[PDB]
């Protein structure tokens, strides 16, 4: 997260860190056994880390649970990043509490202008690199689909939306991928891609979660 703020320990209880010997992507807890992330974060041997603030220090509220199964969206295209979403099932159910909690799925899509919270342990520099140990947060608005498409000609599908600031300076970045975009208590987006980070006229692009609720629910119901 570039241009954001320190969230505060366990203030984003649904935020998870996907670990394969090191943090590599974010995710969102949607129930005691399932996490939503980006399909481009897929890899085998994932350990889901819940209740994290500093990802390099054991602070007392963590739950580390290995993934038992990963399900990349059936129509995920890694070249265009269309349908950049995946589900990860935990080998054991997480113990839900005030610091490890699920986030609700949307019942309807969000609208341009709505303010959302984006979070993660990704790069905090728009030029250069610096990876934080504690969770970073950014409040940002969803941008109109027309401005999104104009910013990224030929690249924005109906399964993507832009959020952020066209002037630059505030955005998600490498390492935040797969993480949450929560608006009014609903998980509306997944950190997916963008041109560099926090660049003028190149806002963040996010997977449009509301288009996937039926797939998420039916997948969970049978797995
Ligand atoms: Ca920790």
UniProtKB/Swiss-Prot annotation:
Binding-site residues, substrate: 171-172, 174-175, 177
Entry comment on modification after translation: Subsequent cleavage after Lys-125 leads to alpha-trypsin. Further cleavage after Lys-170 yields pseudotrypsin. A cleavage may also occur after Arg-99.
GO MF: endopeptidase activity; metal ion binding; serine-type endopeptidase activity; serpin family protein binding
Span of domain Peptidase S1: 1-221
SMART domains documented for this protein: Tryp_SPc (SM00020)
CDD domains, sorted: Tryp_SPc (cd00190)
Bridged cysteine pairs (disulfide): 7-137, 25-41, 109-210, 116-183, 148-162, 173-197
Main location: secreted
BP term (GO), one: digestion
GO CC term, one of those recorded: extracellular space
EC numbers, comma separated: 3.4.21.4
Keyword Secreted on entry: yes
Record: active site: 40, 84, 177
Top-level taxon in the UniProt lineage: Eukaryota
Regulation of its activity: Is inhibited by scorpion cyclotide trypsin inhibitor TopI1.
Membership in a protein family: Belongs to the peptidase S1 family.
Name recorded for this polypeptide: Serine protease 1
Organism encoding this protein: Bos taurus
